[PDB]
Amino acid sequence: STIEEQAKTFLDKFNHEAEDLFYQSSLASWNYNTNITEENVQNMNNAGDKWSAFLKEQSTLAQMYPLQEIQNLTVKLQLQALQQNGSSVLSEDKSKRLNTILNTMSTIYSTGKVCNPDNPQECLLLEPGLNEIMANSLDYNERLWAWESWRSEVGKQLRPLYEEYVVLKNEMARANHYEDYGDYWRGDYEVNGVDGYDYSRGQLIEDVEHTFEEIKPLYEHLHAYVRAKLMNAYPSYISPIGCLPAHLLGDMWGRFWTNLYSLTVPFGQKPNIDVTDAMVDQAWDAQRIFKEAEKFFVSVGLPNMTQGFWENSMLTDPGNVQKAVCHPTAWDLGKGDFRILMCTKVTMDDFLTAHHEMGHIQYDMAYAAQPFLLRNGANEGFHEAVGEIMSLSAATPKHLKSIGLLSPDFQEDNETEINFLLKQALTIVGTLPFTYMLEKWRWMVFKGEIPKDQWMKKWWEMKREIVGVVEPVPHDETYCDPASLFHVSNDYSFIRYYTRTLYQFQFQEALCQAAKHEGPLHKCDISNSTEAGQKLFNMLRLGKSEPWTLALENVVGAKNMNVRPLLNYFEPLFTWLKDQNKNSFVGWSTDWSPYA
Amino acid sequence: LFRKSKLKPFERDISTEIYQAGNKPCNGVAGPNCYSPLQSYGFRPTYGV
């Protein structure tokens, strides 16, 4: 008959096979991750090969239905996703060349190692020692040398391989109807076919810029305060007007500024909030923590976990011969099975991570009724925002007092709030300019406007411009500094870490509005409230069935991301920093260079 | 999973014929727009309720 009925039939078949194949592959992956053996790797390889092959034949078969005869707009999305996510266009030699290049990237990043100068006796890897050195050691020479050495030993090797990789990805994009691979990434937020909700690929770029126009004063004031405080640690090296040295940020690349909290505490005399000793006294174990998280989730009205979750999931490191990765993850194997994979210690951070992962699990359970091809978040950012908003309320003093870990004798005044807001700031605000810079640089390089011989030249030039950080040692085009980043080497979109953050503060400010809360924004709780729970669930259950603009509208009431809630969250910190920066110069000078 | 029409109450059907959906009759062979009518369940102890 008509195309619509045939397409519906094809989808009704495809869902049925896809469920089972996905379940088999995911079960194999979980079995390997909880049990590291070679045969588990073989099972993973076989299941992945079957799944990929089946996706390939389905992508081939789906071509017979032209997309201009579909008006339901719901079949169209599934057809588009299936056609896009399994279509290969490059020639066989080029395809295998790109596969080999990606495998080489992963292998060289995993196997990279640097060690002490002029001594090939003993050497170490990035994860065990280098991270600890850059997070704890205060030696100027050691940090500078390690930062230089890792980049020299990685980026120089990675440069020509990246030069070939960008070209190959460019022809991959050109083979399709996209302008370039950057547009291929930007197409995730694209919305078409709906009046009053259409979102164009290019518009996003502009939007991002506009957002970064409004958050500049807070970032620059924080930068001035940080420079003033670090003047004490390294007086000779740091200039009162120059950019900060790139090897003194507490980590490998300066992505997070958490490690500088001890060196930049506003009021060290006052005690810090901590419950680890309280949990130790009360003899808390993993199951108690997870039950507390479950009770918190129930208290807003969301249903709690199934029996299979409690039986199957593992929460403690097996130890002995049984070795497994302890990276916290939330697995959704499909067909009614949800699990959590993490190794738990008796710490506040694990207590918050439990809530953070349970949020993802609840979001996964929310849209179980949707078709298989639409079981995902509205975009790449909603999932992280949902998983992160709850950790904010989890750490508030009111929730701790209600649970009982914090003694009722605790009081709140200037210093407690200021320290909490500052600790949050060095984790949240600091990473925004770095992410924006990296994404913009990759967009430009994929655009092809920048020639290869200027790749490093522009890279640092904008670093002194936006991030306000100056390299401590000059580099030529032999080095490939961005390649040292894990996400860049492994072909992952990084803009999601900028859309996510600005989303979450829009959500929280909404819920605290519905919870009829009064007072400062950062002291908010939604434990007893239920209207907020149902309002959130209404958006959670949607899945991908609607444009993300409509979903954002249904919660807050706007069709675009906004920066006002984020600034409103940190406003007292902004005023206090403005007071503190009366005698300190604001703004960094790009002319200064540490190496004369 | 696929039938031409509905069923009268208290009725059974065991015939297994390739359910043609496209205009072209494919003469009872597997292929595009020609699916076998009997699907299959998959049961494992690790499923959920």
Ligand SMILES: *[C@@H]1O[C@H](CO)[C@@H](O[C@@H]2O[C@H](CO)[C@@H](O[C@@H]3O[C@H](CO[C@H]4O[C@H](CO)[C@@H](O)[C@H](O)[C@@H]4O)[C@@H](O)[C@H](O[C@H]4O[C@H](CO)[C@@H](O)[C@H](O)[C@@H]4O)[C@@H]3O)[C@H](O)[C@H]2NC(C)=O)[C@H](O)[C@H]1NC(C)=O
């Ligand atoms: C179309 O096809 C593409 C590719 O074939 C699929 O894209 C994948 O989508 C999934 C779902 O988002 C992506 O999975 C995510 O990967 C992130 C990258 O993390 C990497 O690095 C960490 C270590 O830092 C590893 O542990 C991890 O395994 C990755 O190697 C993860 O960070 C994401 O995890 C986040 O969510 C979980 C909860 O789910 C949280 O617990 C985490 O803390 C974290 O916040 C997530 O796992 C995957 O990367 C995509 N592939 C690629 C190549 O990009 C599409 O899904 C597919 N679409 C369909 C079929 O409809």
Ligand SMILES: *[C@@H]1O[C@H](CO)[C@@H](O[C@@H]2O[C@H](CO)[C@@H](O[C@@H]3O[C@H](CO)[C@@H](O)[C@H](O)[C@@H]3O)[C@H](O)[C@H]2NC(C)=O)[C@H](O)[C@H]1NC(C)=O
């Ligand atoms: C686009 O296609 C989808 C799927 O083909 C359409 O969704 C279908 O909507 C109808 C009613 O709108 C659903 O019928 C209902 O079935 C339940 C039993 O499941 C019954 O109890 C109800 O009384 C009603 O008859 C149908 O189930 C649903 N399809 C699926 C797979 O859930 C959608 O309507 C189409 N869009 C437009 C604009 O028509």
Ligand SMILES: *[C@@H]1O[C@H](CO)[C@@H](O[C@@H]2O[C@H](CO)[C@@H](O)[C@H](O)[C@H]2NC(C)=O)[C@H](O)[C@H]1NC(C)=O
């Ligand atoms: C949500 O409701 C529960 C149920 O009463 C609250 O738990 C009580 O909290 C008070 C402290 O405010 C304790 O004195 C009670 O012993 C608690 N009762 C139980 C049964 O645990 C909880 O505090 C409420 N959430 C918020 C944020 O106020």
Ligand SMILES: *[C@@H]1O[C@H](CO)[C@@H](O)[C@H](O)[C@H]1NC(C)=O
């Ligand atoms: C892990 O794999 C080994 C190898 O077959 C197997 O004997 C064992 O039962 C598996 N599970 C655990 C928990 O060790």
Ligand SMILES: *[C@@H]1O[C@H](CO)[C@@H](O)[C@H](O)[C@H]1NC(C)=O
């Ligand atoms: C939460 O779990 C308890 C069992 O611990 C159960 O009695 C209760 O019904 C669950 N909550 C909901 C909303 O079903």
Ligand SMILES: *[C@@H]1O[C@H](CO)[C@@H](O)[C@H](O)[C@H]1NC(C)=O
């Ligand atoms: C501390 O908070 C009180 C609130 O009554 C305010 O009067 C005072 O000015 C604050 N001090 C500082 C240094 O922020």
